[PDB]
């Protein structure tokens, strides 16, 4: 049976995962206690008599964000030993979460993954949720993803990384911590989906017309992206797109595998009555620059590959019609060597709205995940952001003292410099 | 003619197919033959 | 099934009507009259 | 006494065949349960061709489903007319190809192709005489393309004198449904030429055009395309199942439509396609069926038949109609537009009539056409493949599983060898 | 077996053709729903002249409705008898000509002339023996003028041995309904002189004068004028559709009315028109029909026939009439005013009779005249053309799409050429 | 299908369109909520389940006039994001509305036009409602107009502009704004219909016999003018005339596209009962100079071309006879080179009447829109008006600082002078 293990490392992993499984219980009708009052086998395992436990781990060194799940509304849902805690956090240090504090907790992490792998019949992929700015999301995320490649080779890892914004940061050592994570992100992960907080900010401000939402509202509509990505496994549809299709369709070269995200209908409750939401309308809304999950302008780059996961009442005729309209306009630019750049996936279940959520009931949705050459601007900006502080070697005595050598910064800069060179020469016309 | 597919396929045989060939019962009469002899044929043991 | 029974959920909660196909394929009892021609006509302007 | 073994592969082939068995079983009058409830005595004469008599009057098809994910099998199994198939004919894998031609053909293909050829051997020895094999798949995918054409090469090696009907959809011109369509289509055609006997070319855009301009369906569902495809697939083998006035089996169409062995790609279209409202307006005569079948927009292929000459065309007429009216009307298309045909083949058009029509039709026909105009479709596939192969894009998935870059070169060499032969005979 | 394909273009031609099929279908007795519900066997003897037999007893007209805007499609369809036409023959555009001959004939007609020639060819090839193509349009607009004569240009070389009849209205002298009437007229008449086999000139203001002076209608509505046109248009083909004592098809009319190949413009008028008050007083007799037919005010054309000499006149009588009184009254009206006829043609007038009149009428007559007097309109539209062509007004629209002023002089040359031998044969 | 898209710029644009959309709802049966209790397609978008939203945009830099629409009785009619507001008005500055503060809002303005055009299936024209004398109607009006021509080439734009009167004006730099708005309105608009304020004041004083009307009463009958010309797209008629038919029938030369517009029966309640309304009387009253909605004498110039938008129970012959009587009237005069001078358009629906409006119900109506050489005196006065104020550089520092230079006033001056030279040379007999 089709089935995917989800892994949440770092605080941003736990808080998004608290909203992801909230959406997943509402898809399948699972109450928060853990009882249903056969699509659940993708994410839940039927334990004994009527008990469903998630196929997930909440690994975090900081105890306050993991026991908030333990003392929340989902105490009975999760198996208690999946929730792996620690004494002290990684404290925004890549050197800590990789070398001095993460080694004694990653062996506990591999045991639960091994037990979940034996409990699952045929495994299909790994979901890794982390933010590279934090120490736990980058240091412990690198350590867990490195061992999964050794333990389970050639098996796809579908990760979702929250990157720092061009303008807004909640930490100072995020440029240091993002670069070292990316050196471990090229070699081991298969498909990594780019996420950025500020591009979720102006989606909430403009489309959802709410002036001051919080991180609960960001992670709520992130789960709408995550669920529609994996909706093809749970429910039947006309054109199924599984995880193994994602690596072949979207990754042309082994080191270019970073993809943006988009969700087409972002409509508030009162906006739904006035606005008409057709397939041709939402496909244009999906390709709009303001609707993306990463603050980058697609006009600067070219779309090397695209993937459209549709949901709900979507006839295959007009998604064929809407794709033909996208090819005609000059604003959306493809790379010259990829004439066939669209994969379409049509499911047959509309997105589930949560009670008290800001999303309205929409019959049809698109989850656009597309490889682009404009993503090099995101990497180059962080590359220039990190190069400003390494020139004077600020904030290095903390990383050097926690195990790792200063030579790891030069190799991580060289690895991202190869990524800068890669996006230029691949995206250039020939 | 036929007004339904079942009736068309059922009456295919008796109208235009393998049972459409004219039967002597459908023939009004058998013509009287100008045979060479109604006596014994000459070379017929 | 547990005893080898070849079980299969029909999955017909009247969703198979939407799943099905609508090609005419019928030269008998075709719709004759006014509404049959008027159904395929796009609305357009109104007439006073 | 002439049997055809059906093998459905991939997502497209399994979903086409489910509507295909929706049509054939309803034509022979068998219910969803499996017994016989038909009201025609001509149905039960030839059930051997597409079914097997079982205990208690049950009828099971000669269908071997094949896929690498159980998900598409469940939709066929759950759906109506899905219980008729044999459970031991449901050979399937677990990992799934993921639109990789290497996974379907080379690495993961071997783990199932041993468990497929024994099953189809069981059906072939059970029946009396094999008229051929019928396989339905897609070329743009990797599950039904790589495993599909591997199945052709094995079954042609072990049954070398049988026909091979391949019903394959091609990548669409206007849009793309998967990103690796040029890679899969170039590799599949490279293996489908030397193995398959006759190949049928379908395209979704022509299905989308026919569902819109003729049938006037504003929202053509995904099974409207399959019903039109299944209307042909039931009509190819009409002479094997019903009595006819001029019989034409699979090998008559093989010998009359293939001048040279490599030139075995055709295109089809079902003739009396009307809207529901406008059925009263249009009359039903043999000349009116012929006017519709030679229209360029009634083809279910992406090619435009006005851009090339017709090498060989075959018509499979169905219903109560005059043989002179059939034959003199196929002379008119030889004389009204003689520039659109091949000059050095006299009598390009073959016509055959079988006088039992399909379910609910006065008259119908299935039009198979071997045109040199289909070189535009392969050139479209060839030009897309050349754009990606020089840049080596999307290739590390294929070459990471044993199929290195050498086999792509002979794949494109035979791709350009086929379009050179079509273009040469157009002169 | 001789039969007519009707093609209607523009707002005027679609509307007057809807009234044409309103009247003829009442004559042959078929209902608004298409079924036959009349009384006589002579109605069904010649139905193939305008209608196609359909399965189930439906009768569809042989009409192909074309226009560049969907507005005029809705008006014809929503009216009475607007359902009988085939839904496939309702070809239409989206943008609209916008009273522009350049847009109708070059830009917006180009992507729709292929669609109408797909269906005009379909309707012609389906039927047996074409007598000719009958079209109805306007010379003042752009939908029936530019796109209408583009079809006349295209259909001429496709079928160069068939008749052509253009019932086209010309702009009125007293008023104007579009400001670019001389541009639309002189460019369209430039197309009709080499392509149209014969033309029937109509005008709006003479239809108004007939409904006022003769029919005494206070407010003759927009549909009344079309009925006077439709009565004549049904009278041209009287000998095609019904038996007669002296038959005259549409090539007998062509060889008699046309002395020289460029003189194919005619003026027409329906004879028995009396007001409701004058019904109980007027005596329907052939001498009464003669003095109404040759009246100058009874012509539905704008020209006054007393100014010029009749080269050739035709009278298509319908009804049970003594042929000598038909023959003698033609000679009588030829010699009481012999100056108004032409001197070098003996036996100017042509008389034909049919034994089936329109319903209610005991006697009816249709007059077709080839008069010199129609040079008055052609010199008038040439007078209006040269007024604005010197100042180059309303011309950047026509040359904005890529049709320069080169043929404007050629159009003005042809209008001056056409009026030249009208004046030459006057002397 | 036929379509039309309306834009409304400035205070005059919104208040006219407030009266226009109030008129359009009564004709098609649209309730103020937006739900009816086939012909609505031209002005309304059928959204979801029985809700119709207008194909309009309400953009203005000043928020207080847009906010009246938001809090008014049509809060549920328009889409909420469809109405566009700004921070600060241009405030009678063509430099402000075109360069400084109009640039940040025109990028959002083209976003909604693109969404309305994509929902559209066949586009026939654009309706522009603005006053050239105001800062927003001239500045933001020109910037929105010039970007539409590049984005949507060869597409008709029906710009209904309210011009300042020779005797009546309320903003001092209205002559400055009118000349600058004129410099862009020639090469961009396709058909421009001149409107003047106090000619409507004279109509309401004389024809309506009311002494104290306000701008609400003006915009109601202005809405009847817009609804009369566009009624042939929505409703049938004997001689249907489209938006595309207006341009080639009323614009002889590429630079002469200014057209007068008059409404023939404008009669109060108790007056119309004693009045005998026929086609001959309204046709004479249509060409009557005091019924013209711009202060201009039709006797001074020559009527170059004219179109008649007949409505109601009008047979095609009494309009045929009335044109002949108008043609033989010696008071009017046509230009010599245009003998065929009349366009006749008859529609089959009588015009609606707003409850509480000054207009009474009439069986028939005429909208006389004509191109005349008499319009030159409107721009000759404005050229005299502008030249006197520019002679000593009055109110120039308000334009110089906010982007514009001195030369734009110089360059726009001969553009009106070249327009003045074109009118006098096209009316000259030859
Ligand atoms: N969108 C979103 N981002 C979050 C959320 N919580 C944390 N983040 C991101 O996480 C980054 C901070 O690093 P974290 O991942 O929280 O830190 P950590 O990995 O837990 O490491 P420690 O804090 O030392 O335990 C910030 O840049 C945030 O953008 C959340 O709920 N939603
Ligand atoms: N017909 C009509 N004209 C109006 C109306 N409101 C304002 N006007 C005209 O507009 C002129 C004032 O300039 P506007 O265009 O309104 O200035 P604005 O739209 O507020 O633009 P900004 O001042 O920059 O905000 C007045 O002289 C009026 O003639 C109205 O409701 N109807
Ligand atoms: N006509 C038709 N085409 C289909 C159907 N299912 C899939 N396709 C086409 O098959 C092509 C790719 O097939 P794919 O889904 O990759 O098959 P897979 O390899 O088994 O996954 C697409 O272009 C689809 O348009 C179907 O049921 N009917
Ligand atoms: N007799 C008659 N004339 C008509 C009719 N409709 C329009 N006309 C004339 O046609 C001219 C306008 O033509 P128009 O509608 O623009 O033609 P189009 O552009 O081809 O559709 C006017 O001068 C009318 O007098 C009709 O029904 N009957
Ligand atoms: Mg933390
Ligand atoms: Mg303002």
Complete DSSP assignment for F58-84? EE-S-HHHHHHHHHSTTTTTS-TTTEE
With a 6 A CB cut-off, is E414 part of the ligand 4 pocket? Answer: no
Quote the CA–CA distance of D222 and E148 in Å, as a whole number.
40
Q: Which residues of A are annotated as a binding site for GTP?
A: 11, 62, 135-136, 170, 197, 219
Residues found in chain B: 45
What end-to-end distance do the CA atoms of chain E give, in Å? 43
Lookup: tokens for F130: 């603005």
State how far residue C19 is from chain E, nearest Cα, in angstroms: 28
Distance D421 CA to ligand 2 centre (A): 73
User: How buried is A279 (Cβ within 10 angstroms: 0-12 exposed, 13-18 middle, 19+ buried)?
Assistant: buried
Q: Give the SS3 label for residue C48.
A: coil
State how far residue B42 is from chain D, nearest Cα, in angstroms: 44
Mutate to test the pocket of ligand 2, among F64, F131, F221 (most ligand atoms within 8 A of CB): F131
Q: What is the dihedral of CA E213, E219, E221, E224, to 10 degrees?
A: -30
Helix residue ranges, H only, A261-395: 271-274, 279-286, 316-328, 375-391
A165's CB contacts (< 8 A; 6+ apart) are A196, A197, A198, A199, A295
CB pairs E-F closer than 8 Å: 116
Which ligand has the nearest atom to the CA of D178?
3
**Method used to determine the 3D structure:** cryo-EM
In the set F146, F198, F245, F420, the catalytic residue is F245
State how far residue E136 is from chain C, nearest Cα, in angstroms: 23
Q: Give the SS3 label for residue A157.
A: strand
Contact residues of ligand 2, CB 6 A cut-off: F 10-12, 15-16, 61-62, 89-92, 97, 131, 133-137, 162, 170-171, 197, 215, 218-219
Is position D144 annotated in a ligand binding site? yes
Q: Which residues of E touch D278 (CB under 8 A)?
A: 86-88
Radius of gyration for the alpha carbons in chain A, expressed in angstroms and rounded: 21
Of D396, D409, D319, which Cα lies nearest the Cα of D100? Answer: D396
Q: Which residues of F touch A330 (CB under 8 A)?
A: none
Radius of gyration for the alpha carbons in chain B, expressed in angstroms and rounded: 20
Distance F61 CA to ligand 6 centre (A): 7
Of F319, F374, F326, F369, which Cα lies nearest the Cα of F347? Answer: F319
Asked if F235's CB is within 8 angstroms of C46's CB, the reply is yes
D-proximal residues of B, 1-45, CB under 8 Å: 5-6, 8-10, 12-13, 16-18
Asked if A236's CB is within 8 angstroms of D176's CB, the reply is no
Residue E28's DSSP bridge partners are none
Asked if C44's CB is within 8 angstroms of E74's CB, the reply is yes
Asked if D39's CB is within 8 angstroms of B6's CB, the reply is yes
Q: Whose CA is nearest to atom 16 of ligand 1?
A: A11
With a 6 A CB cut-off, is D177 part of the ligand 3 pocket? Answer: yes
Quote the CA–CA distance of A405 and A410 in Å, as a whole number.
10
Of D154, D152, D151, D139, which Cα lies nearest the Cα of D101? Answer: D139
Mutate to test the pocket of ligand 1, among A11, A62, A65, A144 (most ligand atoms within 8 A of CB): A11
Displacement of CA F180 from its chain's centroid (Å)? 18
Q: What is the DSSP letter of E30?
A: B
Measured between alpha carbons, how far is residue E340 from residues E263, E288, E291, E314, E365 in Å?
18, 20, 15, 15, 21
Which ligand has the nearest atom to the CA of F343?
4
- Whether residue A245 lies in the annotated active site: yes
Return the residue of F nearest to E75 by Cα.
F236
Tell me which residue has tokens 């614009």: F251
State how far residue C25 is from chain F, nearest Cα, in angstroms: 31
Q: Which residues of F touch E70 (CB under 8 A)?
A: 1-2
User: How buried is E409 (Cβ within 10 angstroms: 0-12 exposed, 13-18 middle, 19+ buried)?
Assistant: exposed
**D65 contacts D88 by C-beta, under 8 angstroms:** no
**A383 contacts A183 by C-beta, under 8 angstroms:** no
Q: Does D281 touch chain E (CB under 8 A)?
A: yes
Phi and psi angles of residue D64, each rounded to the nearest 5 degrees, phi first = -115, 105
Write out the DSSP string of chain B.
---SHHHHHHSHHHHHSTT-SPPTTTSS-PPPP--S-SS--SS--
Quote the CA–CA distance of A60 and E73 in Å, as a whole number.
70
In sign, the C-alpha dihedral spanning E45, E48, E49, E52 is positive
Instruction: Quote the Cα angle for E351-E353-E355, to 5°.
Output: 170
Radius of gyration for the alpha carbons in chain D, expressed in angstroms and rounded: 21
Q: What is the DSSP letter of E106?
A: I
Angle between helices A174-188 and A375-391 (to 10 degrees): 130
Residues found in chain A: 430
**A351 contacts A311 by C-beta, under 8 angstroms:** yes
Which helix (H) or strand (E) covers residue E267, if one does? strand E265-270
Helix residue ranges, H only, F152-191: 174-188
CB pairs A-D closer than 8 Å: 115
Q: What is the dihedral of CA A314, A316, A322, A324, to 10 degrees?
A: 170
**E137 contacts E10 by C-beta, under 8 angstroms:** yes
Enumerate long-range contacts of A215-220, CB under 8 Å, 24 or more apart. Answer: A215/A15, A216/A19, A217/A358, A219/A15, A219/A16, A219/A18, A219/A19, A219/A20, A220/A19, A220/A23, A220/A354, A220/A357, A220/A358, A220/A359
Q: Beta strand A51-54 with A44-47: parallel, antiparallel or unpaired?
A: antiparallel
b/e map D363-383, b = 16+ CB within 10 Å: bbbbbbbbbbbbbbbbbbbbe
Q: Which residues of B touch C30 (CB under 8 A)?
A: none
Distance F97 CA to ligand 6 centre (A): 11
**F269 contacts F360 by C-beta, under 8 angstroms:** yes
Q: Does C35 touch chain E (CB under 8 A)?
A: no
The ligand 4 atom at the shortest distance from the C-alpha of residue E225 is 1
Which helix (H) or strand (E) covers residue D241, if one does? helix D238-241
Quote the CA–CA distance of E350 and E367 in Å, as a whole number.
10
**D407 contacts D303 by C-beta, under 8 angstroms:** no
**E182 contacts E385 by C-beta, under 8 angstroms:** yes
Distance F112 CA to ligand 6 centre (A): 21
A116's CB contacts (< 8 A; 6+ apart) are A5, A55, A57
Q: Which residues of D touch B9 (CB under 8 A)?
A: 40-43, 356
Of F32, F58, F30, F33, which Cα lies nearest the Cα of F42? Answer: F30
E333's CB contacts (< 8 A; 6+ apart) are E290, E294, E349
Quote the CA–CA distance of F59 and F82 in Å, as a whole number.
9
D50's CB contacts (< 8 A; 6+ apart) are D4, D6, D24, D28, D61, D62, D241
Return the residue of F nearest to C47 by Cα.
F236
In sign, the C-alpha dihedral spanning E94, E96, E101, E107 is negative
Q: Beta strand A157-163 with E2-9: parallel, antiparallel or unpaired?
A: unpaired
Helix residue ranges, H only, F91-136: 94-95, 103-119, 135
Which ligand has the nearest atom to the CA of A340?
3
Of D48, D24, D4, which Cα lies nearest the Cα of D155? Answer: D4
Mutate to test the pocket of ligand 2, among F59, F95, F162, F218 (most ligand atoms within 8 A of CB): F162
State how far residue F341 is from chain E, nearest Cα, in angstroms: 5
Phi and psi angles of residue F272, each rounded to the nearest 5 degrees, phi first = -70, -25
Radius of gyration for the alpha carbons in chain F, expressed in angstroms and rounded: 21
What end-to-end distance do the CA atoms of chain D give, in Å? 43
Q: Whose CA is nearest to atom 3 of ligand 2?
A: F12
Q: Which residues of C touch D360 (CB under 8 A)?
A: 25-28
With a 6 A CB cut-off, is D72 part of the ligand 3 pocket? Answer: no
Tell me which residue has tokens 């235009």: B16
A-proximal residues of F, 113-132, CB under 8 Å: 115, 118-119
Q: What is the DSSP letter of E108?
A: T
Quote the CA–CA distance of B2 and C29 in Å, as a whole number.
12
Asked if F80's CB is within 8 angstroms of A209's CB, the reply is yes
C-alpha atoms less than 13 angstroms from C-alpha of F390 in its C-beta half-sphere? 21
Quote the CA–CA distance of F427 and E82 in Å, as a whole number.
48
Of D115, D100, D103, D107, which Cα lies nearest the Cα of D66? Answer: D115
Asked if C47's CB is within 8 angstroms of E83's CB, the reply is no
Q: Does D424 touch chain E (CB under 8 A)?
A: no
Of E341, E398, E358, E423, which Cα lies nearest the Cα of E102? Answer: E398
Quote the CA–CA distance of E27 and E31 in Å, as a whole number.
10
């Amino acid at each position: 049976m089709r089935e995917v293990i989800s892994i949440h490392i770092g605080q941003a992993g736990i808080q998004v995962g608290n909203a992801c499984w909230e959406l997943y219980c509402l898809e399948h009708g699972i109450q928060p206690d853990g009882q249903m009052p056969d699509a659940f086998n993708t994410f839940f395992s039927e334990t004994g008599a009527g008990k469903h436990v998630p196929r997930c781990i909440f690994l975090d060194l900081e105890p306050t964000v993991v026991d908030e799940v333990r003392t929340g509304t989902y105490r009975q849902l999760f198996h208690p030993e999946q929730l792996i805690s620690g004494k002290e956090d990684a404290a925004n240090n890549f050197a800590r979460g990789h070398y001095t504090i993460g080694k004694e907790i990653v062996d506990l992490a591999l045991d639960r993954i091994r037990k979940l792998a034996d409990n699952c019949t045929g495994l299909q992929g790994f979901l890794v949720f982390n933010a590279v700015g934090g120490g736990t999301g980058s240091g412990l995320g690198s350590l867990l993803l490195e061992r999964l490649s050794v333990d389970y080779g050639k098996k796809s890892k579908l990760g979702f990384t929250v990157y720092p914004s061009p303008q807004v940061s909640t930490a100072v050592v995020e440029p240091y911590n993002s670069v070292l994570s990316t050196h471990s992100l090229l070699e081991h992960t298969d498909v990594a989906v780019m996420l950025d907080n500020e591009a979720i900010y102006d989606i909430c401000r403009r489309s959802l017309d709410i002036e001051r939402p919080t991180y609960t509202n960001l992670n709520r509509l992130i789960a709408q992206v995550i669920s529609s990505l994996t909706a093809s496994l749970r429910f039947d549809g006309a054109l199924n797109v599984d995880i193994t299709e994602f690596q072949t369709n979207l990754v042309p070269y082994p080191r270019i595998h970073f993809m943006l995200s988009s969700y087409a209908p972002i409509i508030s409750a009162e906006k739904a009555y006035h606005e008409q939401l057709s397939v041709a309308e939402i496909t244009n809304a999906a390709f709009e620059p303001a609707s993306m999950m990463v603050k980058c302008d697609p006009r600067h780059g070219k779309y090397m590959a695209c993937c459209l996961m549709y949901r709900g009442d979507v006839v295959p005729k007009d998604v064929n019609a809407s794709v033909a309209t996208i090819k005609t306009k000059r604003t959306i630019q493809f790379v010259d060597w990829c004439p066939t750049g669209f994969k379409c996936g049509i499911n047959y279940q509309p997105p589930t709205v949560v009670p008290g959520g800001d999303l309205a009931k929409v019959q049809r949705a698109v989850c656009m995940i597309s490889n682009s050459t404009a993503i090099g601007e995101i990497f180059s900006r962080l590359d220039h952001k990190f190069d400003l502080m390494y020139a004077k070697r600020a904030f290095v005595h903390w990383y050097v003292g926690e195990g790792m050598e200063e030579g790891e910064f030069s190799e991580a800069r060289e690895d991202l410099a190869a990524l800068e060179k890669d996006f230029e020469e691949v995206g250039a016309e020939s | 003619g036929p007004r339904s597919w079942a009736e068309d396929c059922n009456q295919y045989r008796t109208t235009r197919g393998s049972k459409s060939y004219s039967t002597l019962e459908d023939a009004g009469r058998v013509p009287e033959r100008y045979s060479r002899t109604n006596y014994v044929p000459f070379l017929a043991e | 099934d547990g005893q080898g029974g070849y079980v299969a959920r029909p999955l017909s909660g009247s969703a198979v009507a939407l799943r099905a196909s609508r090609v005419p394929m019928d030269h008998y009892d075709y719709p004759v009259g006014n509404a049959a021609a008027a159904a395929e006509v796009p609305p357009g302007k109104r007439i006073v | 006494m002439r049997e055809i073994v059906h093998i459905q592969g991939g997502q497209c082939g399994n979903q086409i065949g489910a509507k295909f068995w929706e049509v054939v079983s309803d034509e022979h009058g068998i219910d969803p349960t499996g017994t016989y409830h038909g009201d025609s005595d001509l149905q039960l004469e030839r059930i051997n061709v597409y079914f097997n008599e079982a205990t208690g009057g049950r009828y099971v098809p000669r269908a071997i489903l094949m896929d690498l994910e159980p998900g598409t099998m469940d939709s066929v199994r759950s759906g109506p007319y899905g219980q008729i198939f044999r459970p031991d004919n449901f050979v399937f894998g677990q990992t799934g190809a993921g639109n990789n031609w290497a996974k379907g053909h080379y690495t993961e293909g071997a783990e199932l192709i041993d468990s497929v050829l024994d099953v189809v051997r069981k059906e072939a020895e059970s029946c009396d005489c094999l008229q051929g094999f019928q396989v339905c798949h897609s070329l743009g995918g990797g599950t039904g393309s790589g495993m599909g054409t591997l199945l052709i090469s094995k079954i042609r090696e072990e049954y070398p004198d049988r026909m091979m009907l391949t019903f394959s959809v091609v990548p669409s011109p206007k849009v793309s449904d998967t990103v690796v369509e040029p890679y899969n289509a170039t590799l599949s055609v490279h293996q489908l030429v030397e193995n398959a006997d006759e190949c049928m070319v379908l395209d979704n855009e022509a299905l989308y055009d026919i569902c819109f301009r003729t049938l006037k369906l504003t929202t053509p569902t995904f099974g409207d395309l399959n019903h039109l495809i299944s209307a042909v697939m039931s009509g190819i083998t009409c002479c094997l199942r019903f009595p006819g006035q001029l019989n034409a089996d699979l090998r008559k169409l093989a010998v009359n439509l293939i001048p040279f062995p490599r030139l075995h790609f055709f295109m089809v279209g079902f003739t009396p396609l009307t809207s529901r409202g406008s059925q009263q307006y249009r009359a039903l005569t043999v000349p009116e069926l012929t006017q519709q079948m030679w229209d360029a927009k009634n083809m279910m292929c992406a090619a435009d038949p006005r851009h090339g000459r017709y090498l060989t065309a075959s018509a499979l007429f169905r219903g109560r109609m005059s043989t002179k009216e059939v034959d003199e009307q196929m002379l008119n298309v030889q004389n009204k537009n003689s520039s659109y045909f091949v000059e050095w083949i006299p009598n390009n058009v073959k016509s055959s009539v079988c006088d039992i029509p399909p379910k609910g039709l006065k008259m119908s026909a299935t039009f198979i056409g071997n045109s040199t105009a289909i070189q535009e479709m392969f050139k479209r596939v060839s030009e897309q493949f050349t754009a990606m192969f020089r840049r080596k894009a999307f290739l590390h998935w294929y070459t990471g599983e044993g199929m290195d870059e050498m086999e792509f070169t002979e794949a494109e060499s035979n791709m350009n060898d086929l379009v050179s032969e079509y273009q040469q005979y157009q002169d």
